[PDB]
Symmetry: C2
Subunit: 398 residues, 2 copies
């Protein structure tokens, strides 16, 4: 099978690498990005790791014509969007125009606004069912695997899921004074926004990082976990019936939160451009220029991550709570694919969803066709693939 991937990110290095480790399903992996230096480093690395060999071909994913051009040049079974969420619509359109299969790991987001919303991508459901294709939205860890965990609970453990708390802890040490999980422009747009959660029909808003619980993360410890809006809550509230409260929490250190409140104070997190010696510059972009980009840090990053879902509900007129979670070692990820645990936990699920599609395990024939979030699909084989590809989960009743 043949598949084209857009993005040579920290995440991008993982998805490609993971495809090369499953050469039995991925014979033709073509890798496409704005800057080719990244793509050759991935290419050259995989060959050093023993993982076969990939096509590098530059393209500016913002221009739909050049994608259409690249898609039909290799006519692939699926295209993986692991570039920035801006390119979601431009790549998703070039998939429709070439009747090809699309998966991303992130919502749509416009550079001139810090809004998260599926409805721009969801609009393609008529157009996609029609062109008899599939677009699987948000197939990272969160969103994606967390949806799968909730999906998986809904089938196997719960009659009705009353509450959902997604909990994301990154207890890694990148050994630098201040650095980010992934691309700083998108990460820091996300976390500094007014957090948001669903309870009893209406959505509630909070000032950024207003709410905070302490949570005990298996294999780590007790950590301050702050409340955030996250993409998956949009799809999951719509798709999981019964839901009374749905929240997302993330751990941040004091040191991280301080740097972030300082940079915010001087204007370094600004999305609107500002003139400096003639030139018009966006601060938060310049922050990304200045900061080490994260791939660099996997070499010396140590720690583990824990991400998962804490659900309360009812099964056979009796109460039960479930915790599904995945722990992941930064050093172990480095030594497998040269990346750290955030690149890792995101790329592997996307490579899995690719495998689902190529295997027709997830199919537009033998289901409705069109645009779907992960919790809508058959998750059973997806979860089994996650185990096989390095994201084993725990499952815990109380």
């Amino acid at each position: 099978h043949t598949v084209l991937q857009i993005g040579a990110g920290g995440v991008g290095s993982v998805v490609a690498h993971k495809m090369g480790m499953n050469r039995d399903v991925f014979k033709n992996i073509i890798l496409a990005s704005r800057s080719l230096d990244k793509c050759y480093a991935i290419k050259e690395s995989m060959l050093k790791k023993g993982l076969g060999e990939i096509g590098v071909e530059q393209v500016d994913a913002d221009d739909t014509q050049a994608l259409v051009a690249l898609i039909q040049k290799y006519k692939p079974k699926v295209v993986i969007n692991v570039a920035l969420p801006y390119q979601d619509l431009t790549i998703m359109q070039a998939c429709l125009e070439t009747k090809t299969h699309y998966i991303d790991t992130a919502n749509y987001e416009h550079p001139d606004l810090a809004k998260f919303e599926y409805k721009e991508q969801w609009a393609f459901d008529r157009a996609y069912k029609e062109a008899r294709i599939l677009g699987v939205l948000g197939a990272g860890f969160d969103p994606g695997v967390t949806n799968a965990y909730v999906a998986h609970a809904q089938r196997h453990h719960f009659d009705t899921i009353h509450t959902l708390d997604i909990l994301d802890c990154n207890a890694g040490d990148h050994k630098r004074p201040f650095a980010t999980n992934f691309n700083p422009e998108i990460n820091l747009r996300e976390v500094s926004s007014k957090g948001r959660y669903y309870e009893n029909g209406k959505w509630i808003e909070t000032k950024p990082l207003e709410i905070k619980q302490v949570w005990a993360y298996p294999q780590i410890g007790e950590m301050d976990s702050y409340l955030l809006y996250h993409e998956e809550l949009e799809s999951l509230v719509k798709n999981i019936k019964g839901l009374r409260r749905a929240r997302f929490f993330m751990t941040f250190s004091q040191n991280y939160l301080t740097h972030m409140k300082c940079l915010e104070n001087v204007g370094m997190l600004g999305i609107k451009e500002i003139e400096h010696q003639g030139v018009k510059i966006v601060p938060i972009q310049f922050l990304k220029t200045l900061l080490p980009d994260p791939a660099t840090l996997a070499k010396d990053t140590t720690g583990k991550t824990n991400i998962g879902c804490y659900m309360t509900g009812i099964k056979n007129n009796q109460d039960k709570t479930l915790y599904i979670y995945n722990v992941c070692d930064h050093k172990k990820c480095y030594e497998e694919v040269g990346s750290q645990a955030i690149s890792y936990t995101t790329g592997v699920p996307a490579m899995c969803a690719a495998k689902m599609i190529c295997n027709d395990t997830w199919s537009a024939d033998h289901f409705r066709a069109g645009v779907f979030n992960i919790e809508e699909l058959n998750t059973d084989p997806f979860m089994e693939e996650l185990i096989k590809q390095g994201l084993p989960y725990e499952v815990i009743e109380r």
Copy 2:
């Protein structure tokens, strides 16, 4: 008398304003800067304040020819350099070429290095004694008035000054999350440098803000005061004989020191340029673009400043300690000249040194001619002018 001033800074607004308030000595004040918007706001303000009327004429002080051109266009008695320390040599040269009188408020500093040193300006002593002119170096508050305080002590209170501690506290509240005394590019270059002090012949270095005493500032309170190198120590160690220890301390809040350590961590205090989307940008300059420039903040700044000199010594084989200091109110400064207390405490002394020169009170005939620091001149009339222009001092023995 006629005098030309280069700089429409926060400081610049004070020096011009203060000259207009002494119209009996300043009949022709011409004001020269890179951007004319500042100069008209000063012009238009003085007229609103009742202070007469000034000439605005743009010039790029980096190009010595255009200065020579501006100097001879109005042939003035003195030129006041209140632009950035980079223009020190270019303006100081155009003074020699036109045989005119020069005063600045800051050392020489090259944009590609964070070094403070008088020797680049001191080199002009032969050339200046020859052209029978005068260059008074560092005639702000610190440096400048503090030199005068030490000078004044040396004559009137001490036989030999064993120790000198200069103490600078700014207890103002500019009502913003983070902002700077003066131009952020120069301020933040200064404070984040390895501090330095003189004791027993050799100079000692310390990591930035390594050393810290608590000091009780009259009319304020007890404040954490951190040790810094400051320009005046260079000239004063050379010029005041007897000196066993000479230090400079400045107060910084935790909040300020945190912002500064964060910005330092991400690279926002960098003097070397760095490529971003083609363009090559200096971070710390961009920081200055981003931050409110300080003049803006005088409108709502409240608090007081205390700056002065704590000296121990011997007079008539008996020990004595002297504290000379000046307290200054941010709101009171706003309402007088529209500026805050740092702009104020710096501009007034420069306007005074101008008055000394125009009055021939400080003269190249009836003294050596050439290049001098403030402690080298007759300070008695200078101090009296400071009192008259709003910088009264206290003098305290123990």
